Design a protein around this ligand. Structure first.
Ligand SMILES: [Zn+2]
Lengths: 49, 53, 286, 287
């Protein structure tokens, strides 16, 4: 629940952790998110259109 | 040499006795260094990574 | 406003640099530097800082020397290279709090926003936390004394972001991590008594002295609440806590069972090998 | 035509500043400077180290502003930092820590003043947090190609310079290129201060705060962890019921990599917390 698996658009797969800012509300699967080049943290998510 | 064997052996007694605190130091320190290196190679492993096959 | 702040070792090591570049002056008075950080977020975070020359007078304590040009230049260039950090407040290495410090902080109270004051020691003989974060605010006094700048204690923690931990750990190669076990815990369980001992001994003596033997009404009123806290525990007879002691000792019994059983499991391979290996080695020896 | 053995002295100052420069070590090319004082030929000490504002041009000899340089240096002269620049440092993220054409050219241009010109390249990006160890760089002369490469004494430190054991870049780029050893310096003040500060960093303010917390959490939190511990231990024991059969069959060789011992020992180590905090609770209750 704390750490999940992410899928990049380019096709390689990775895994990240959980930032102390965001909560487990939007952390649920089925939602496209965003990552950082350093430490692979999460600033926010990426809502589909 | 018969009575001298005692006094000559006493040196070996002290020499074998002095190794006690030594092996104490070794066994107490090298385990701390063991867990040190263990956590050193443990912290190498990180959660973020790439998944292969 | 700010519940807690984060102070990185880098600034205190910059104070170590202040004690470095001295070069045997023969003055070595208090030196006021300029602390930098992020006031945007609720929690304060210290990254890096710089140093400005600060001098005072022997007799007159109202003498304080700062520089506006050097400050604007250093902060200007620092903002030029890094826009993620701005000005917050200042700090001094003086063990004692001077009366002129309100006038020294008044400048940054005017030009800049509210500044936080940090007091450290010149000689690291203090076992306790060297860094004390003091916020500058104006509070209403109950006794009716005129409104003045009051320093309130703010809790703080010493930590690093990413690489600083590695740098420190590499430069030291002495200190050990948490390392749950016997020695790491028992060391704390030993020395903590002294940690409380030296502190309390250094405190309650000067306290007892200055209360009866002294003046300048620092508002002793809070110390009645101190003594009240000391009276919050009127020697409980533990009679109600007997069941709790029973549960704790029961958990102790659980620890006993677990230890005995597990060690009994470990003894298997040893008390097998000690026989089967020795007898085979002996019979195959000759 | 004389050459001695040089060793670069590195303090915690430049190290930490290069760690902040490591946070500044973004793929955008950055500039840095190092200052110090030369007591003699074969020793070099660095003290004052700062960063430089980023640019779109990247690392170049044109990127460095001479008037701004001399200005900041003068501002350091009026202050308590009377040290001349001993060289310059930078970062080379992701393409390796080696030096390109422009880099060695601006190095050639910046070494016109100082014969030493210490070159330091930090790349925390692909560098694991396990080791912060860095390797300083040097520039060999182009007229020494006829004679031997490195006429340096004290060959005992080459094993300490063997830390970059990579089988590619070293003897691959070894032509007209080499490195220099790195050592540190620490006094009693820095030692005691940093040790006390770090110990306090791993400790609490009054130090009596978060202890009793866990002491009273032993009956709530730890208990569940003890239950899970018993679950895993039982999960081992069910196999331990199968073990004496194998011990009654083979006994020759070990096909099981699982030790089954040290882990349970560690479980006991976690179980000793209750015993260790018991005396703590006793001291709290007593006085
Ligand atoms: Zn590049």
């Amino acid at each position: 629940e704390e750490k999940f698996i992410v899928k990049a658009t380019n096709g390689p797969r990775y895994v990240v952790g959980c930032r102390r800012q965001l909560d487990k509300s939007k952390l649920k699967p089925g939602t496209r998110v965003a990552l950082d080049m350093t430490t692979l943290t999460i600033m926010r998510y990426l809502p589909r259109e | 040499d018969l009575y001298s064997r005692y006094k000559k052996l006493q040196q070996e007694l002290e020499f074998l006795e002095v190794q006690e605190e030594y092996i104490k130091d070794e066994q107490k320190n090298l385990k701390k260094e063991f867990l040190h290196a263990q956590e050193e190679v443990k912290r190498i492993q990180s959660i973020p990574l790439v998944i292969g096959q | 406003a700010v519940q807690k702040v984060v102070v990185h070792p880098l600034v205190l090591l910059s104070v170590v640099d202040h004690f470095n570049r001295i070069g045997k002056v023969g003055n070595q008075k208090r030196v006021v530097g300029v602390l930098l950080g992020s006031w945007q977020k609720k929690v304060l975070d210290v990254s890096n800082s710089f140093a400005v020359p600060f001098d005072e007078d022997d007799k007159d304590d109202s003498v304080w020397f700062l520089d506006h040009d050097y400050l604007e230049n250093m902060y200007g260039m620092f903002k030029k290279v890094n826009a993620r950090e701005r000005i917050v407040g200042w700090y001094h290495t003086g063990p004692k709090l001077h009366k002129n410090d309100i006038a020294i902080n008044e400048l940054m109270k005017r030009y800049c926003p509210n500044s936080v004051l940090v007091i450290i020691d010149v000689k690291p003989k203090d076992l306790g936390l060297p860094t004390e974060a003091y916020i500058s605010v104006e509070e209403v006094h109950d006794d009716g004394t005129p409104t003045s700048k009051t320093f309130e204690h703010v809790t703080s923690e010493i930590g690093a972001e990413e690489a600083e931990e590695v740098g420190v750990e590499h430069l030291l190669r002495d200190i050990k991590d948490t390392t749950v076990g016997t020695l790491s815990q028992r060391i704390t369980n030993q020395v903590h008594g002294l940690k409380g001992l030296n502190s309390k001994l250094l405190d309650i003596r000067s306290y007892l002295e200055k209360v009866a033997t002294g003046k300048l009404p620092i508002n002793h009123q809070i110390i009645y609440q101190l003594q009240d806290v000391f009276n919050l525990l009127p020697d409980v007879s533990l009679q109600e806590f007997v069941k709790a002691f029973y549960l704790k000792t029961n958990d102790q019994m659980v620890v006993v069972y677990l230890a005995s059983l597990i060690r009994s499991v470990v003894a298997l391979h040893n008390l097998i090998n000690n026989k089967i290996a020795n007898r085979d080695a002996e019979k195959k020896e000759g | 035509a004389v050459d001695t053995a040089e060793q670069v002295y590195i303090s915690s100052l430049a190290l930490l500043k290069m760690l902040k420069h490591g946070r500044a070590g973004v793929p955008m090319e950055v500039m840095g400077l190092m200052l110090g004082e030369f007591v003699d030929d074969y020793t070099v000490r660095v003290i004052d180290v700062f960063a430089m504002p980023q640019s779109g041009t990247g690392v170049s000899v044109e990127a460095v502003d001479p008037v701004f340089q001399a200005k900041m240096l003068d501002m350091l002269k009026q202050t308590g930092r009377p040290e001349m620049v001993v060289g310059w440092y930078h970062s080379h993220p992701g393409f390796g820590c080696w030096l390109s054409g422009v880099d060695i050219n601006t190095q050639q241009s910046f070494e016109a003043l100082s014969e030493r010109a210490v070159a330091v390249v930090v790349d925390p990006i692909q560098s694991v947090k396990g080791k912060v160890v860095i390797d300083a760089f040097r520039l060999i002369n182009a007229n020494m190609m006829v004679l031997g490469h490195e006429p340096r004494q004290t060959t005992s430190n080459l094993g300490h310079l063997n830390k970059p054991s990579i089988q590619a870049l070293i003897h691959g780029l070894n032509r007209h290129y080499y490195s220099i050893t790195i050592n540190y310096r620490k006094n009693e003040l820095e030692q005691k201060m940093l040790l006390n500060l770090h110990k306090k960093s791993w400790m609490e303010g009054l130090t009596l705060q978060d202890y009793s917390e866990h002491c009273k959490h032993n009956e709530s939190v730890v208990k569940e962890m003890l239950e899970l511990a018993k679950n895993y231990n039982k999960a081992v024991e069910e196999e331990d019921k199968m073990t004496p059969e194998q011990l009654a069959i083979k006994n020759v060789g070990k096909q099981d990599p699982k030790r089954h011992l040290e882990e349970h020992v560690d479980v006991l180590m976690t179980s000793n917390i209750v015993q260790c905090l018991a005396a703590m609770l006793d001291t709290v209750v007593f006085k």
